[PDB]
Design a protein around this motif. Structure first.
Motif, PDB file in Angstrom:
ATOM      1  N   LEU B  12       0.846  -1.174   0.000  1.00  0.00           N
ATOM      2  CA  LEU B  12       0.000   0.000   0.000  1.00  0.00           C
ATOM      3  C   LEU B  12       0.889   1.233   0.000  1.00  0.00           C
ATOM      4  O   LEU B  12       0.732   2.136  -0.817  1.00  0.00           O
ATOM      5  N   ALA B  13       1.831   1.261   0.927  1.00  0.00           N
ATOM      6  CA  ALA B  13       2.743   2.378   1.032  1.00  0.00           C
ATOM      7  C   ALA B  13       3.459   2.619  -0.290  1.00  0.00           C
ATOM      8  O   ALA B  13       4.052   3.685  -0.492  1.00  0.00           O
ATOM      9  N   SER B  14       3.413   1.631  -1.180  1.00  0.00           N
ATOM     10  CA  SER B  14       4.049   1.743  -2.489  1.00  0.00           C
ATOM     11  C   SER B  14       3.165   2.481  -3.479  1.00  0.00           C
ATOM     12  O   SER B  14       3.638   3.343  -4.206  1.00  0.00           O
ATOM     13  N   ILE B  15       1.886   2.128  -3.516  1.00  0.00           N
ATOM     14  CA  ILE B  15       0.946   2.776  -4.418  1.00  0.00           C
ATOM     15  C   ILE B  15       1.245   4.266  -4.436  1.00  0.00           C
ATOM     16  O   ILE B  15       1.467   4.859  -5.497  1.00  0.00           O
ATOM     17  N   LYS B  16       1.251   4.866  -3.249  1.00  0.00           N
ATOM     18  CA  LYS B  16       1.510   6.290  -3.126  1.00  0.00           C
ATOM     19  C   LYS B  16       2.785   6.692  -3.844  1.00  0.00           C
ATOM     20  O   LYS B  16       2.828   7.741  -4.482  1.00  0.00           O
ATOM     21  N   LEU B  17       3.816   5.857  -3.742  1.00  0.00           N
ATOM     22  CA  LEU B  17       5.093   6.117  -4.407  1.00  0.00           C
ATOM     23  C   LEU B  17       4.834   6.138  -5.917  1.00  0.00           C
ATOM     24  O   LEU B  17       5.289   7.039  -6.622  1.00  0.00           O
ATOM     25  N   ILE B  18       4.095   5.148  -6.409  1.00  0.00           N
ATOM     26  CA  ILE B  18       3.792   5.081  -7.829  1.00  0.00           C
ATOM     27  C   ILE B  18       2.957   6.275  -8.264  1.00  0.00           C
ATOM     28  O   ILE B  18       3.282   6.951  -9.242  1.00  0.00           O
ATOM     29  N   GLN B  19       1.872   6.534  -7.547  1.00  0.00           N
ATOM     30  CA  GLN B  19       1.016   7.655  -7.885  1.00  0.00           C
ATOM     31  C   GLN B  19       1.766   8.978  -7.974  1.00  0.00           C
ATOM     32  O   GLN B  19       1.584   9.736  -8.928  1.00  0.00           O
ATOM     33  N   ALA B  20       2.602   9.247  -6.973  1.00  0.00           N
ATOM     34  CA  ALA B  20       3.382  10.480  -6.897  1.00  0.00           C
ATOM     35  C   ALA B  20       4.233  10.784  -8.128  1.00  0.00           C
ATOM     36  O   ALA B  20       4.204  11.901  -8.627  1.00  0.00           O
ATOM     37  N   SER B  21       5.002   9.814  -8.610  1.00  0.00           N
ATOM     38  CA  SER B  21       5.826  10.036  -9.798  1.00  0.00           C
ATOM     39  C   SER B  21       5.193   9.265 -10.937  1.00  0.00           C
ATOM     40  O   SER B  21       5.365   8.055 -11.058  1.00  0.00           O
ATOM     41  N   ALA B  22       4.454   9.960 -11.781  1.00  0.00           N
ATOM     42  CA  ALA B  22       3.798   9.288 -12.879  1.00  0.00           C
ATOM     43  C   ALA B  22       4.730   9.150 -14.060  1.00  0.00           C
ATOM     44  O   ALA B  22       4.281   8.977 -15.191  1.00  0.00           O
ATOM     45  N   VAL B  23       6.030   9.233 -13.807  1.00  0.00           N
ATOM     46  CA  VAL B  23       6.987   9.111 -14.893  1.00  0.00           C
ATOM     47  C   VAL B  23       7.044   7.682 -15.417  1.00  0.00           C
ATOM     48  O   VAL B  23       7.401   6.752 -14.695  1.00  0.00           O
ATOM     49  N   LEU B  24       6.671   7.529 -16.684  1.00  0.00           N
ATOM     50  CA  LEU B  24       6.659   6.243 -17.358  1.00  0.00           C
ATOM     51  C   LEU B  24       7.238   6.395 -18.747  1.00  0.00           C
ATOM     52  O   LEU B  24       7.171   7.471 -19.345  1.00  0.00           O
ATOM     53  N   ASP B  25       7.792   5.301 -19.255  1.00  0.00           N
ATOM     54  CA  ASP B  25       8.402   5.259 -20.573  1.00  0.00           C
ATOM     55  C   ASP B  25       7.495   4.511 -21.560  1.00  0.00           C
ATOM     56  O   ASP B  25       7.863   3.467 -22.092  1.00  0.00           O
TER      57      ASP B  25
END
Lengths: 130, 141
Positions: B12-25
């Motif tokens: 769960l604590a990760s989702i936030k990490l993913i959401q925060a930086s929407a940087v994708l290739d």
């Protein structure tokens, strides 16, 4: 054992935001904390900030800074670094392979791989690992 | 479960990490593919591999920088977030072999095969409201 080794570090970081200040110009700080992607070249500078904190935080507790404690790099990362750079920040700190991250008595470096696992927990709140 | 609980918490604590930086290739097209409700055929494996991975080694691929092993909690978090229930399984199949945080820390090679991954990532997805996708994401190509 390590649980504690963390805590002492988290509590150190939480406390720095005031009483003391690090060797950081509002530039380097915006640089380290902003969401602006760390372009390749920026490697040298990122390292130097993460260090500035890591060692800095250390000096501001009285701990020696020969081998930088894993827990501090993880904390200094979790806390300061923005998700846009977390991972990359780890692989950058691995690059500052100072201590052979004690894992089963064997003197094995502080691979970036585990640094993430740590910072990822710190942020998660756990750290009551083991 | 006091163990299976902390795993989740990290995921769960990760989702936030993913959401925060929407940087994708990924091109917007690629994004549509990866988040589509259309099944991933056996040929689409190559494409999917690139997509699911582009979500894990995030900003790492946007720029150059080498790749480095990610924790299951963080992968499981990625799949639960981006992937559609239809392909989620093949995703776990793709990302099988990862290790949980604990084992990453003590150096106890415990590869988490697809089956397990699948089971866990599904429970991760199952629980997380403040997680869901929006549009301030379709801004990378």
């Amino acid at each position: 054992e390590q649980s504690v080794r963390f805590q002492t570090a988290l509590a150190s970081i939480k406390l720095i935001q005031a009483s003391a200040v690090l060797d950081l110009t509002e530039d380097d700080f915006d640089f380290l904390t902003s969401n602006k992607v760390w372009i390749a070249t920026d490697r040298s500078r990122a390292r130097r900030c993460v260090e500035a904190c890591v060692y800095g935080t250390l000096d501001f507790v009285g701990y020696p800074r020969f081998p930088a404690p894993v827990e501090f790099i993880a904390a200094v990362i979790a806390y300061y670094v923005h998700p846009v750079n977390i991972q990359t920040a780890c692989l950058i700190m691995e690059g500052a392979e100072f201590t052979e991250n004690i894992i089963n008595g064997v003197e094995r470096p502080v691979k970036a791989a585990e640094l993430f696992a740590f910072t990822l927990r710190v942020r998660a709140g756990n750290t009551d690992v083991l």
